[PDB]
Design a protein around this ligand. Structure first.
Ligand SMILES: [Mg+2]
Lengths: 217, 136, 120, 163, 99, 45
RNA sequence: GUUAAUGUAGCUUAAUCAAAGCAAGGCACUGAAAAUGCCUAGAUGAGCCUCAGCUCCAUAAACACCA
């Protein structure tokens, strides 16, 4: 029983910006706001607003708004970063900067001599090597890029066997800190993709079960 | 009574006990005494996520030993004024810290755990994993 | 004139009574039994009971406790038993559901706190 | 939780000297010679379905939920009494009879379930009616005359009443 | 050497008088409560799918690790041990506006 | 999953009024801090 | 496509008063848990039949298979 040894890697991009809220979560947010300010004790700003609103009414017959309008204008004048750097492009699946809300994963295109391969990035390890070392090595080597990715465990994520011979595909989880992609226009096709899209582009049953150990968020 | 069959029927104390190293064996590998530092600027948020961690642990059978708050660090931020050249202005902030200690783990459970923790991270929440030795 | 069981009093609750009200609260249903020291349940009202179940809503509610109380009072009078002991837990005494159960039982005409023994 | 678990443990038949043993569970296990009327035959699944439905309908209303949160609700006791008489009543009446030792002094060993409800009452005056429920107390003044008796049967029927 | 911040500051003592009124009609009351029940159901389904998720993940771990043990014993000699790289794990939460 | 613990109120018994604040550290990044001052924004140098 | 089994809510009751007990959730209460209080969602795998029978679907355990 000859055993073909193949390491493999599940590469996780951190979600950058927070998601919008479900209608229910929104109504609940409103409620929590209301009740929070309902049980609240005074305010310094509201002390100086109300006490002076009354005391000026007593100095007329016998501030706060300034600050309000100041902060209004200093907020309104300022402008913020776009929540969508994806849909303004609306095209690139290959951009690492694509989706801010979700976590993203790397795919590659390869056409081998006898085969057509859409590939979650794979490794090949010699018996003397550790699956770990081969994971890292394959990562840094294949993508032609400088990647800081903090790995989690020494234990692998999920495993799928193709037996013609017999063979193994061992998927590992790597958490991407900061990648630097050299030659952003290289021919090798690297696709950065969410959960639904990972469901779409993946033909095999070996790569079909990767969304089983993936974090659906 | 010692002679009788019913002896020691009322025996209890072995049921209730009323009276630190990581174990690394390389195959069954138990790495314990771990510190979770949840640090954030907002009180409510930090407490809430600390809470979520605690409850999550209790559900996963992972043993929590001590859950406690670290001393808040009071920040005084000095912002430059444009009119006066070297003139300073001020704004006050505060850093809040919570701590959850877990007593045991395995490789697989470490991998899983961290996934769940960082997946559920709220905005403005800084997470840390460390070792039991710390000085208050 | 009969004998109650004086005794125990290392343990709890008191076993001294002819009749004892017992209120069990499941995470689903409220069950009120009236017991005799034999352990034998004499007269009871439960929320699992179709008669009570079908008329009202939310089997576990305060409302349900009140209900069961009224039903039980009724059946108690019908059974000829006007007196029983109720021994709640300190925190069950503070609870609303049970305060209103006791109220329902009182207005129903059943007195808690049994009469004393004669020549005890 | 402990209290519960303990009371369940105190109901099991242990192999050591116990309170139940000495203090008279009253014959303990007893095989019951039963002279009954045969239990009414009703479809399990059908009944279940109907009840599920009724509870769906009752839970559906918003009015009901309002009645629940605000602690204002009442149960139409007469109807509950009717349903109880119709359904599990016979068994409760039975165990009351067991408690008061009706079966012990009458048939000596024998338990029957009172399938047909029996409504007895006395006339205390023109407008006054004193009911006889199982186990209730009545004054001999009330009982000076023969009582009114009511139960439901069509007639091919023949019955015997006994006081 | 413990000093807690759980304590209520002195500033908050006599300024209490600012927030006496609270009142709701039948509307706000029933709305809030209904919403709360709704919310509990929601949170429940959420916890459920969460636990089912981590459970499925753990099952992928079972099949995986067991597959690797059935193939090469040396490989669960290697990978069943926990690496020193995990001691100072640090991660920052998402933000509202990207840099 | 980021909205999990995000929805909460401060649970201490006696406390000041807390108002939503947008805080910009030195990134280009913004966060939401509850702060007593009604000011809609603050930024660190 | 073949054999030994099944499909009660997350695990275990009952199926002649009746779908039961426990986990599990929310909010309140104290710093977290916990307890307690007020609350929340729930099932007899799906289609016919006789008043257990016939299939289907799916899981699971194997084998065959497929890559
Ligand atoms: Mg039934």
């Amino acid at each position: 029983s000859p055993w073909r040894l193949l390491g493999a890697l599940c590469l996780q991009r951190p979600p950058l910006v927070t998601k919008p809220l479900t209608p229910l979560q929104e109504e609940m947010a409103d409620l929590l706001q209301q009740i929070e300010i309902e049980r609240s004790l005074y305010s310094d700003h509201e002390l100086r607003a109300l006490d002076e609103a009354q005391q000026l009414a007593k100095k007329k017959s016998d501030l706060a708004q300034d600050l309000e309008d100041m902060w209004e204008q200093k907020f309104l004048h300022f402008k913020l970063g776009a929540r969508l750097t994806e849909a303004d492009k609306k095209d690139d699946r290959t951009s690492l900067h694509r989706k801010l809300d979700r976590n993203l994963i790397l795919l590659v295109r390869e056409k081998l001599g006898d085969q057509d391969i859409w590939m979650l990035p794979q490794s090949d390890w010699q018996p003397g090597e550790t699956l770990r070392q081969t994971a890292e090595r394959t990562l840094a080597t294949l993508s032609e890029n400088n990647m800081e990715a903090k790995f989690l465990g020494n234990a692998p994520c999920g495993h799928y066997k193709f037996k013609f011979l017999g063979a193994k595909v061992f998927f590992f989880k790597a958490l991407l800190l900061t990648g630097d992609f050299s030659q952003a226009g290289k021919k090798g096709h690297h696709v950065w993709v969410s959960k639904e899209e990972l469901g779409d582009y993946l033909k095999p049953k070996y790569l079909a079960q990767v969304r089983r150990f993936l974090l659906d968020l | 009574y010692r002679s009788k069959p019913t002896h020691g029927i009322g025996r209890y104390k072995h049921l209730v006990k009323a009276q630190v190293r990581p174990i690394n064996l390389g195959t069954d590998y138990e790495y314990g005494v771990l510190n979770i530092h949840l640090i954030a600027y907002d009180m409510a948020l930090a407490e809430s996520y600390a809470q979520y961690v605690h409850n999550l642990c209790n559900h996963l059978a992972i043993k929590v030993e001590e859950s406690y708050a670290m001393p808040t660090k009071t920040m005084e931020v000095l912002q430059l004024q444009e009119q006066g050249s070297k003139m300073f202005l001020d704004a006050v902030l505060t850093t809040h810290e919570r701590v959850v200690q877990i007593s045991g783990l395995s490789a697989t459970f470490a991998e899983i755990f961290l996934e769940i923790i960082h997946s559920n991270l709220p905005e403005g929440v800084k997470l840390s994993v460390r070792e039991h030795t710390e000085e208050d | 004139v009969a004998r109650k069981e004086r005794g125990w009093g290392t343990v709890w609750p008191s076993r001294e009574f002819w009749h004892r009200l017992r209120v069990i609260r499941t995470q689903h249903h409220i069950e009120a039994l009236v017991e005799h020291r034999n352990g034998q349940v004499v007269v009871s009202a439960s929320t699992r009971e179709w008669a009570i179940k079908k008329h009202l809503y939310s089997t576990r509610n305060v409302v349900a406790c009140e209900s069961v109380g009224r039903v039980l009072a009724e059946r108690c009078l019908e059974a000829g038993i006007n007196f029983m002991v109720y021994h709640p837990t300190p925190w069950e005494a503070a609870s609303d559901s049970i305060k209103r159960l006791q109220h329902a039982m009182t207005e129903g005409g059943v007195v808690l706190r049994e009469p004393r023994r004669i020549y005890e | 939780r402990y209290r519960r678990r303990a009371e369940q443990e105190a109901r099991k038949p242990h192999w050591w000297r116990t309170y139940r043993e000495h203090f008279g569970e009253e014959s303990g296990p007893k095989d019951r010679v039963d002279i009954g009327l045969p239990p009414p035959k009703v479809s399990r699944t059908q009944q279940l379905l109907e009840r599920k439905q009724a509870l769906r309908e009752l839970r559906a209303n918003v009015e009901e939920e309002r009645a629940a949160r605000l602690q204002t609700a009442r149960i139409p006791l007469e109807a509950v009494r009717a349903e109880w008489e119709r359904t599990c009543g016979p068994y409760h009446k039975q165990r009351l009879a067991e408690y008061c030792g009706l079966y012990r002094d009458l048939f000596h060993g024998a338990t029957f379930v009172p399938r047909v409800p029996l409504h007895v009452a006395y006339a205390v005056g023109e407008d006054d009616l004193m009911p006889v429920y199982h186990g209730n107390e009545v004054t001999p003044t009330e009982a000076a005359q023969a009582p009114e008796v009511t139960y439901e049967a069509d007639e091919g029927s023949l019955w015997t009443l006994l006081l | 050497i413990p000093i807690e911040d759980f304590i209520t500051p002195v500033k908050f003592l006599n300024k209490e008088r600012q927030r006496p009124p609270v009142e709701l009609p039948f509307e706000e009351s029933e709305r809030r409560a209904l919403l709360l029940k709704r919310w509990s159901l929601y949170k429940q389904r959420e916890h459920e799918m969460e636990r089912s998720a981590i459970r499925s993940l753990l099952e992928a771990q079972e099949e995986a690790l067991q597959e690797l043990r059935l193939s090469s014993p040396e490989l669960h000699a290697e990978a069943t041990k926990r690496d020193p790289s995990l001691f100072p794990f640090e991660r920052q939460g998402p933000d509202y506006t990207p840099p | 999953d980021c909205n999990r613990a995000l929805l909460t109120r401060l649970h201490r018994q006696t406390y000041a009024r807390l108002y939503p604040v947008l805080l910009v550290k030195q990134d280009g990044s913004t966060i939401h801090i509850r702060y007593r001052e009604p000011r809609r924004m603050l930024t660190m140098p």
